[PDB]
Amino acid sequence: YGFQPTNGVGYQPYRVVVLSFELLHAPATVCGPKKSTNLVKNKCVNFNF
Amino acid sequence: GYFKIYSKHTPINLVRDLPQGFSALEPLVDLPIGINITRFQTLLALHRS
């Protein structure tokens, strides 16, 4: 490459990373974070424990 | 695709045969790994001296 500071756009280096996943072939183990709320008591509510 | 291991430890005073008692085996660990196991071996710690 000819990477130089004087070079403008289209010539400066760019750091690129591509991320890939799989689609339902093996037991999933990398998943997004799970949210949480505050715990209430003695009130008719619904829960998702 | 789940490898389940259950374990239990129990003191014994009988010499050779299995004891005449009842004791359940609580779960120890679960591993989410997919391998189509068919055979297994054992490891021995011999005294090399």
Ligand SMILES: *[C@@H]1O[C@H](CO)[C@@H](O)[C@H](O)[C@H]1NC(C)=O
């Ligand atoms: C079981 O064996 C077959 C033999 O081809 C293989 O295709 C399959 O992936 C195995 N199952 C697991 C869970 O490894």
